Amino acid sequence: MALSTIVSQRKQIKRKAPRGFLKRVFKRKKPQLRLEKSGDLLVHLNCLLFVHRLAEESRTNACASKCRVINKEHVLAAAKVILKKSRG
Template sequence: MAPTTTVSQRKLIKRKAPRGFLKRVFKRRKPHLRLTTDSDLLVHLNCLLFVHRLAEESRANACENKCGVIKKDHVLAAAKTYLLLFVGATPTLYPGEQKGVIISRAHSI
């Protein structure tokens, strides 16, 4: 009998942060840093918040384009907007660029 390609709906989702993995990555990249015990949780929380904001903005872009499915273009446009806001550049729309695709001349993505 061939294995099925569908994923079971009963598969459990991990509810805990991957603390060991994050600590190991920190130690490999920056071994000289002295971090508090909860710094890995703060990094994990920051990543979750970024993904949540990216999903909200992508959904808004999809609704704006009257599309029922979030596509790659919607996510890329949202990522460009948010990454520019995190860098501190003001997102502007230059002549000749598509509406919804925001690129700064200083930080082109």
């Protein structure tokens, strides 16, 4: 397999969430606010749902645009709608 192409992961990594990374990001972005006890878990869940939406959209865009391998324009066009739908 070429280094440019990555095969799909047959096994999923452990479902442990990087709570420290999310806390550090939320602190460096908005340091004036304070997150609650387990808000990072809800942020992780929202990120999981966003990634799932983006993945399915990129998959259908790549399979509908005469392609067996996900390219850059496919995920680009998927993000251009997913990012707009994810805000409210």
